[PDB]
Amino acid sequence: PAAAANYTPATLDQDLRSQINSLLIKEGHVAKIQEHLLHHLHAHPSNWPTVVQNHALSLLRSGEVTSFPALLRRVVEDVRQDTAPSLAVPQSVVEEALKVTRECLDQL
Amino acid sequence: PAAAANYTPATLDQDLRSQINSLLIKEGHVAKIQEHLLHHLHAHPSNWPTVVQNHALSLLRSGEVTSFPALLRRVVEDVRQDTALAPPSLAVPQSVVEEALKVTRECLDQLCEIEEP
Amino acid sequence: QIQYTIPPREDYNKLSDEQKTRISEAFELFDSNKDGLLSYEEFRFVLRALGFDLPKQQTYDMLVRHGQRPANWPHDQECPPVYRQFNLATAQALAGTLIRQRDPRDELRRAFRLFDVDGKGMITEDDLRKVCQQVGNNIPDADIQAMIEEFDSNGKGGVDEDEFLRLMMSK
Amino acid sequence: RQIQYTIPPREDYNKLSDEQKTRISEAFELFDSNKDGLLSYEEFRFVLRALGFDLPKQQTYDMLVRHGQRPANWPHDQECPPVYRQFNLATAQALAGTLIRQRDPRDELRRAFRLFDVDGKGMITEDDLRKVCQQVGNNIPDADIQAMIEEFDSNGKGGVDEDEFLRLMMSK
Amino acid sequence: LMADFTKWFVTGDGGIMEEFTEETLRHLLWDVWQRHQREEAERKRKAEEEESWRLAREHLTHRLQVKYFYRWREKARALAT
Amino acid sequence: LMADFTKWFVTGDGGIMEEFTEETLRHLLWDVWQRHQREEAERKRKAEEEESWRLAREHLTHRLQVKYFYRWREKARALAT
């Protein structure tokens, strides 16, 4: 019930029509939660959260950030620098995301 | 008894041999002790010792005097001068003096006699 | 943001000798290292000694704006705000500004809390007596009785915060 | 006969350092609870004891009679006793100054030795240095304090006695 | 190929990886945030127990009490006539 | 009359009244002296324990300990080379 239509290949490709369509259909018989679950359970083994927490802690300890939203913005900004101890999410769970999302996206 | 020498009357008189002699005779077969008793007993009623003590206290509390001998010399001088002026004063009341006259008189009457020229 | 800059002294100069002496006193107290320099937390304490319980944000702003690097730090490398220190000048200027900016009511409220330790909400004769015992000087109970009765407008047996402040600010 | 009420000289107060003068003013202001800028006899005694002076009553009394000023409330037509006289900041400053400048440097050190060694053991050990470290608040590595003891322990007794403490604290 | 589409879908901008990492960071950071708060409570409490501070505090207390007590008593004495 | 002689003897210089007053003063004054000593011990004791002095003392102790401790440690590290 879903046609790729050359699938908008580039990782940077900015398509929201297809994305909101697929996401909307996918939300029915929700899969988002399955991905989230599998990912956390597969996210903790690599030892990333401790890195993140220690960084956030340092940020709070220095006193540079003094509110949770600011801490969130600061840290999300920091992790975002995947391209640059790295706060980048391990490639393993990315491959896992690829697998499970592919599997759950194959059905549609 | 002891024959005297016409008593050298004025209080400030000079003869000291008769005085020490009389003291010598008096200490033997002691009578001095009676004087001490009668005096203490008659000295405490006028309430003099408390005044003396309070003065000594003030002197010690101020810190003006810091040794017992100095305290003694000071208080002795003080009573010396108050006693000088009298005729709260630390002068010894006249009562006990009169008492001294009486008791000393009786003791001396028993002890000695005074010849007449 | 401009950074490492020395703070202005204008708000420190208009102080009296007592105050300046109190600042220098606090500094010298919390200056255990004797180097004429304070750590960040030592500076926080120095301000807390003057009666200022500022939030981390404000002291951190002070830290980045007016914090000087330590000597041991290699100049070829960047220094984080937290590792910076305060000379006497910065502490003086900052404390001065803080003091002249301080609301006059704060010290009085603090004091009211010092007098009324039980948190009853008012200062009674007993409290004044305890404080008298703390000061060391003995005052006749008529005076303290008058200290309460003259300013008690409710006949409650004490003086509340409002009355304390009002009487303490009154000429 | 004795001269009385005279103001004390500042010559011995002037050559002091800012620290000393400030500490004196601090002590004065501390024990000046009435805030009248004047001290009683005992307040002044405490002010001197705050500087670390345990003078005998005789000396402070001499100071009192020589440099004690009558209070204002006192009727000027009658004599006031020495004990009722008070000390302004100037007198306290001058007297304290003389006292500080005349004091030998060993006194403060002996006192300090008693402060480090509170148990009266007769020597300062590593534990004491550790306690003092805890008192000050700063944490120093045990190698330093171990070196603070060992470098100056000439008996191998496990501490530093008074003599050694003074000798080392006075050393150039 | 579906694999390419899912690749774009998961690691693209507004991808699943972004929403996920954002969410997990939100909750994780909240946890460590509360942790830091508790830690600060304890650190402040222990920091307060320092002696230098106790001295500064006591000195201040005494000074204030003196100042405002005598000021107060002065006002009282004034009004008492 | 004997009374005149007694008068000379008692109210004279070196009289019994003089020696008496001296002695009684000696003993009475010694008593009040020891008394004063004990009173001073207790009064000083009570005067010491209270705040103002305690603040001055604590301040003194701290300042001294700091000064000579760090001075000492300086000597030590200096010697360690």
CB contact set of C117 (below 8 Å; sequence gap of 6+): C127
Q: Establish if D20 touches chain B: CB-CB under 8 angstroms.
A: no
- Which two tokens mark D62? 């001499």
From the list C35, D137, D170, C25, the residue with the least C-alpha distance to F68 is: D170
Instruction: Kindly provide the resolution of this structure in angstroms, with one decimal.
Output: 3.3
Beta strands D123-124 and D160-161 are antiparallel
Give whole-number Cα distances, C128 to B27, C113, C135, D35, in Å: 67, 12, 10, 18
What gap in Å lies between CA A87 and CA A75, rounded to an integer? 9
**Chain C contact set for D47 (CB, 8 A):** none
The angle, 0 to 180 degrees and rounded to 10, between the axes of the packed helices C17-30 and C40-49 is: 140
- Parent domain of E10: 1-81
The number of angstroms, rounded, from the C-alpha of B91 to the middle of its chain's C-alpha atoms is 12
**What are all long-range contacts of F17-25, with beta carbons under 8 Å and residues at least 24 apart?**
F17/B92, F17/B97, F17/B100, F20/B35, F20/B36, F20/B39, F20/B100, F21/B76, F21/B79, F21/B92, F22/B76, F24/B39, F24/B40, F24/B43, F25/B52, F25/B72, F25/B75, F25/B76, F25/B79
Residues D87 and D5 in one domain: yes
C-alpha distance from D45 to closest chain F C-alpha (Å): 11
Q: What is the amino acid identity at position F50?
A: E
- Which two tokens mark F47? 């005067």
Q: Establish if D136 touches chain C: CB-CB under 8 angstroms.
A: yes
Strand partners, C38: C86
Number of domains in chain C: 2
Residues D85 and D113 in one domain: no
Residues C88 and C124 in one domain: no
CA angle D144, D146, D150 (to 5 degrees): 115
CB contact set of F56 (below 8 Å; sequence gap of 6+): D27, D30, D31, D46, D49, D50
Beta strands B112-113 and D87-88 are unpaired
Residues C2 and C78 in one domain: yes
Q: Establish if C59 touches chain A: CB-CB under 8 angstroms.
A: yes
What gap in Å lies between CA F15 and CA F13, rounded to an integer? 5
Of all residues in chain B, what percent are helix, strand and coil, respectively (each to 5)? 65, 5, 35
Cα distance between the two ends of chain E:
100
Q: Establish if A8 touches chain E: CB-CB under 8 angstroms.
A: yes
User: Are E7 and A98 a contacting pair, CB within 8 Å?
Assistant: yes
The number of angstroms, rounded, from the C-alpha of B31 to the middle of its chain's C-alpha atoms is 15
Residues D20 and D85 in one domain: yes
Residues D84 and D114 in one domain: no
C136 and F70 within 8 Å at the Cβ level: the answer is no
Which positions 45-84 of A are in contact with C (Cβ < 8 Å)? Answer: 61-64, 66
DSSP C85: B
Beta strands C159-160 and C122-123 are antiparallel
Strand partners, B112: B2
What gap in Å lies between CA C50 and CA C59, rounded to an integer? 14
User: Are C123 and C159 a contacting pair, CB within 8 Å?
Assistant: yes
Give whole-number Cα distances, B50 to A5, B40, B89, C136, F30, in Å: 122, 13, 12, 31, 14
CB contact set of D128 (below 8 Å; sequence gap of 6+): D116, D117, D118, D159
| Dihedral sign (CA E10, E15, E19, E21) | positive
**Chain A contact set for C81 (CB, 8 A):** 62, 64
Q: What is the 3-state secondary structure (H, E, C) of chain D?
A: CCCCCCCCCCHHHHCCCHHHHHHHHHHHHHHCCCCCCEECHHHHHHHHHHCCCCCCHHHHHHHHHHHCECCCCCCCCCCCCHHHCEEEHHHHHHHHHHHHHHCCCHHHHHHHHHHHCCCCCCEECHHHHHHHHHHHCCCCCHHHHHHHHHCCCCCCCCCEEHHHHHHHHHCC
Q: Establish if D26 touches chain C: CB-CB under 8 angstroms.
A: yes
Count of CB pairs separated by less than 8 Å, C with D? 14
- Say whether the F–D interface has 3 or more Cβ pairs within 8 Å: yes
Torsion of CA A58, A59, A61, A65, to 10 degrees: -170
Residues C96 and C120 in one domain: no
User: Are C136 and F51 a contacting pair, CB within 8 Å?
Assistant: yes
D82 and B66 within 8 Å at the Cβ level: the answer is no
Q: What is the amino acid identity at position A103?
A: E
DSSP C159: E
What gap in Å lies between CA D8 and CA D92, rounded to an integer? 9
DSSP SS3 for C100:
helix
C-alpha distance from F13 to closest chain B C-alpha (Å): 6
From the list D62, D47, D45, the residue with the least C-alpha distance to D6 is: D62
Taking residue A47's Cβ as centre, other Cβ atoms within 10 Å add up to 9
Q: How many helices (H) and strands (E) does chain F have?
A: 3, 0
From the list D148, D3, D113, D19, the residue with the least C-alpha distance to D67 is: D3
Q: Establish if C60 touches chain A: CB-CB under 8 angstroms.
A: yes
Give whole-number Cα distances, D16 to D20, D49, D101, D172, E80, in Å: 6, 18, 8, 21, 46
From the list A88, C112, A16, F34, the residue with the least C-alpha distance to E68 is: C112
| Dihedral sign (CA D79, D81, D86, D92) | positive
At which of D81, D103, D125 does a domain end?
D103
Q: What is the amino acid identity at position A67?
A: S
- Parent domain of C43: 1-102
Q: What is the amino acid identity at position B18?
A: S
DSSP B29: T
Give whole-number Cα distances, C17 to A27, C20, C25, F16, in Å: 72, 5, 12, 68
From the list C11, D117, E25, the residue with the least C-alpha distance to A72 is: E25
Q: Method of determination?
A: X-ray
Per DSSP (E only), the strands in B1-117 are 2-3, 112-113
What gap in Å lies between CA A15 and CA E9, rounded to an integer? 10
F59 and E59 within 8 Å at the Cβ level: the answer is yes
Taking residue F81's Cβ as centre, other Cβ atoms within 10 Å add up to 4
Residues C92 and C108 in one domain: no
From the list D46, F51, C25, A21, the residue with the least C-alpha distance to E5 is: A21
DSSP SS3 for F50:
coil
Best A60, A64, A77 residue to mutate vs chain E (most E CBs within 10 Å): A60
Taking residue C140's Cβ as centre, other Cβ atoms within 10 Å add up to 8
From the list C17, C26, C25, the residue with the least C-alpha distance to C52 is: C26
- Which two tokens mark E5? 């589409």
- Say whether the C–D interface has 3 or more Cβ pairs within 8 Å: yes
Residues D15 and D93 in one domain: yes
What gap in Å lies between CA D87 and CA D61, rounded to an integer? 12
- Which two tokens mark C113? 């809390």
Q: Residue F59: exposed, middle, or buried by beta-carbon count in 10 A (0-12, 13-18, 19+)?
A: buried
Q: Establish if C2 touches chain F: CB-CB under 8 angstroms.
A: no
What gap in Å lies between CA B18 and CA B8, rounded to an integer? 9
Which positions 71-110 of B are in contact with F (Cβ < 8 Å)? Answer: 71-72, 75-76, 79, 92, 97, 100-101, 104-105, 108-109
What gap in Å lies between CA A93 and CA A71, rounded to an integer? 24
Residues across chain C: 171
Taking residue F1's Cβ as centre, other Cβ atoms within 10 Å add up to 10
DSSP C38: B
Taking residue C101's Cβ as centre, other Cβ atoms within 10 Å add up to 8
Residues D136 and D171 in one domain: yes
| Dihedral sign (CA B110, F5, F1, B38) | negative
Residue with tokens 């705050």: D50
Residue with tokens 């003099």: B48
Residues D19 and D93 in one domain: yes
At which of D103, D138, D156 does a domain end?
D103
The number of angstroms, rounded, from the C-alpha of D146 to the middle of its chain's C-alpha atoms is 30
**Chain D contact set for C32 (CB, 8 A):** 136-138
Residues C52 and C91 in one domain: yes
User: Are F42 and B81 a contacting pair, CB within 8 Å?
Assistant: no
Cα distance between the two ends of chain A:
6
**What are all long-range contacts of B55-61, with beta carbons under 8 Å and residues at least 24 apart?**
B55/B90, B56/F28, B56/F29, B56/F32, B56/F33, B56/F36, B57/F32, B57/F35, B57/F36, B60/F32, B60/F33, B60/F36, B61/D83, B61/F36
At which of D57, D87, D103 does a domain end?
D103
The number of angstroms, rounded, from the C-alpha of B100 to the middle of its chain's C-alpha atoms is 8
The angle, 0 to 180 degrees and rounded to 10, between the axes of the packed helices D41-50 and D18-31 is: 140
The number of angstroms, rounded, from the C-alpha of D165 to the middle of its chain's C-alpha atoms is 20
What gap in Å lies between CA E26 and CA B80, rounded to an integer? 98
Give whole-number Cα distances, B28 to A107, B20, B31, F10, F22, in Å: 141, 12, 8, 18, 22
Strand partners, B34: none
Number of domains in chain F: 1
